[PDB]
């Protein structure tokens, strides 16, 4: 615990030791803000604090202002004091502060800072004799002449305190080229409150992904349609990828070469067979050995962390990776995948760095030709795998992927899926290519698909739209996948309009997913980018709502969803604050 | 007519919708259930209106003779048309019946469901699917008994329901018989569930908004109006 | 508007500070408009003038609310109605307090479903 | 390990295979039946070894309230995958539940069944 102390001292400097000795329990860090006047005597405090090396101490000087005389001097002093208070604040703790030192203007500015940014306990010190030496004040406190007065307890504005990320790139606020960004903070909060209290139409609401404290200029920027130049901002924006296949990462390039050792913007329609053959260099024929599989997992996790993705669900085929000849069962392969993902997550978390939580989905591969017991085997494997319990990474769902044609609709194995539904395991369907509304309907209502894949043609089935919107089941709409396979506007010969915009207007919980990064050659960031020309008139607010839908649709426990929501809200606020200025 | 005449003068109007109760073994033959469902779907088919028919209801006496796993085949058509079902799977009903109501009837709400705390898997799926759980504080307190009831040991589970993450909503059931409207129903939570917070009450209101059967656009307008009104009331609440 | 008055020579007699303002010696320092809280004044209705009083009837009405501001994750980010973020912090921590019987007025004014 | 140790020294060794009991658990969060079935299926799917899982067994709470005419739909996956089925029923049950076990669960063994002499 770092009981950081902040103070300001004028002609009298010995008050800071009085503040330190006011609480006999003892502080840990003490900092003093003072101007560059010559009346200060830092030597007494320096030698007093040198007698206790275990307590950190530092001195900051406000250069150029001997004393506050005019409006500019006071505003510069206030800006510097606010910057110092917000830069010396503990990362996860409200610091203490004593107002006794300094003249009235410093005292008022310091109290204002404490109110804005929060403090554990603001207090005062009162000296009956006003000592000038350590010995006399020591005698006074031994007798009982020491007096400490405490009046306030301020939480401050969390939004204001989350602003310290913009402190750098200012060189230290030199008066020649200084912009009082803390005054920008105060005008932001004042304008937001005044606008909220002086209107009703604006004061309706607006941002459901939660924020509402950004400067009004930032909100206007958000409401504007997103352009192709927002790539840096959106890459800095954390994302969620609920549909990503492990076996389609290192399908080509140096990544494939290095995993073997141990496009991406097409304008012609590609059949599914060619898309599957594009990744034929990896998967069943290659990942049988343990080394290649481990390398694939580590590379995928590294790419996900690089792309700032904060959560993802991975679909992998344990049976396609098993090797009975080398005693590599499907269960062993899945155990290896879970163990390496857990190891990577723990390694990333232990260093207090951004990490990407990943959960696996067992894909019930569609064969419909031979060994039809494979589906039951996959279901049993998934149930036993989720029954592990322990581990940050676990099994949360089963994917009903494969050839979604009429031959393998949802009216085949529902009695079998009774078993998976009994054990509290989620089910994800896939009925998005070459399917009838009837198939989607009883896939929703018999398979009890808590999440739906693709389903690009819901526009022509209003009853299906009402069913999906009312039941709040998601949609795994993949922009680049249908761009390459189906194709939409404004590509040549492709006059069809992408239903993503209309899906958002209707209210479907659409989640943009990357499908296969390796095969498509485009990551989730490019997946969100392509919406600028794929769906004209799309705005950044809709992108934020897409992220909210993705986080609200994933198969996670309520507590983990709460933690993810907290982190995502904080990070989105921080990145928006950083990006609006630059 | 009441809603339109209240809105024309630009006052506070309570938008209201109807639920068609389909009781079990209440009047004799069970063909009355089919008649009720047919009437409900035909009524919803009106198309244009302000006070519409959101869905149907499933209510019974206690159990067995009024179980929730008897009328799936009858319910297929009405549930396919586009209505909604709020099964009364609760009030000393075994967890199997609640499971049938959730997974075969596709019921979007459960009445009371006070004893849900003893079925961890049923809980888990309820929170995982955000199935609304309507609970009546005063009614259940009167007809079942919860602390601080004299000579009683059990206590109301609403606090744990909210902590777990169930989309709980507070209701009134029968105003006249119980003698308590929504205001005192919510107020009694202070002495019924100790430690309940005001933000918890606001989340209860939010959940009540969430689990209601309304269109997306109407839900958005209702949410905006509720948020603005909520901000005004908490602005002028700390006054007292 | 809360502000400060600073005088270089700290005048005592009225003519001195008058002459000071004639030139402009007295400068004006303010930190900005303070909305405060939009509604807290029913304390003066519930608490009468109390002209006859002493230290015995000291009212700590808000101090315990101030004490319980941070002394006390779900309650942190369970925030619905995003405009509640704009709401000033004191009433936010007020909402964080446990419910009580004497909140019937707020409950009745509360829009419900 | 015990079987291999006994066989290496060329002594007399008793080959041992395991039966996964599917306890009835009258209510008992009845998803445990599906959990047991999945565990048995994947245990057999492990494949390589000397000792192996050969089948499942259902028993416990033998009264008519827990007869074999309930879970006849859950036993499709276990039976298609390749396992074997056993059904303990007949100590004090009716002579029809045995027929249900034989012709519905496809049970290849009948535990006890001491009252078979009264149903020709
Ligand atoms: N569920 C989570 N998912 C991802 N990261 C998390 C999660 N929970 C905690 N963290 C990490 O906690 C750390 C807290 O960091 P902090 O609040 O000090 O902000 P920061 O260090 O200035 O910037 P950054 O958030 O990028 O680290 C974050 O880095 C974040 O990566
Ligand atoms: Mg896919
Ligand atoms: Mg009722």
Author numbering:
A (entry chain B): 1 to 262, 281 to 600
B (entry chain A): 361 to 600
C (entry chain A): 121 to 192, 200 to 240
D (entry chain E): 361 to 480
Sentences from the paper on this structure:
In order to identify novel CARF effectors, we used Foldseek18 to search for proteins with structural homology to CARF domain of the Cam1 effector. This method rendered a 600-residue protein containing an N-terminal CARF domain followed by a linker region and a C-terminal adenosine deaminase (ADA) domain, with accession number HAJ98955.1 from an unknown Bacteriodales bacterium (hereafter named CRISPR-associated deaminase, CRISPR-associated adenosine deaminase 1 [Cad1]), for which homologs were already identified in a previous bioinformatic screen. cad1 is located immediately downstream the cas10-csm genes of a type III-A CRISPR locus. Further analysis of cad1 homologs showed that over 70% associate in genomes containing type III systems (mostly belonging to the A and B subtypes) and exist within many unique phyla of bacteria. These data suggest that Cad1 is a widespread effector in type III CRISPR-Cas systems. Altogether, these data demonstrate that Cad1 deaminates ATP molecules to ITP through the formation of an hexameric complex that requires a Mg+2 or Mn+2 cofactor and an activating cA4 or cA6 ligand. While the triggering of a growth arrest in the host is a common strategy of all CARF effectors, we believe that Cad1 introduces a new mode of defense for CRISPR-Cas systems that couples nucleotide deamination activity to a sequence-specific, RNA-guided adaptive immune response.
Given that ATP is the putative substrate of Cad1, we obtained cryo-EM structures in the presence of this molecule and found two different conformations with either symmetric (3.4 Å resolution) or asymmetric (3.6 Å resolution) positioning of three ATPs. In both cases, one ATP molecule was bound per Cad1 dimer, unexpectedly not in the deaminase domain (inset with red border) but within a closed (not the open) inter-domain pocket lined with amino acid side chains belonging to both the CARF and ADA domains. We wondered whether this mode of ATP binding was important for Cad1 activity, and therefore, we mutated the basic residues shown to interact with this molecule in the solved structures (inset). In all cases, we made aspartate substitutions to change the charge of these residues and found that while K584D, R588D, K164D, and R162D did not affect Cad1 activation in staphylococci, K589D (within the deaminase domain), R161D, and K165D (within the CARF domain) prevented a complete growth arrest. Third, we unexpectedly found ATPs bound in inter-domain pockets between the CARF and deaminase domains, with three ATPs (anti-glycosidic bonds) in apo-Cad1 hexamer increasing to six ATPs (syn-glycosidic bonds) in the ligand-containing complex. This observation suggests that ATP binding to non-deaminase inter-domain pockets impacts the activation of the deaminase active site.
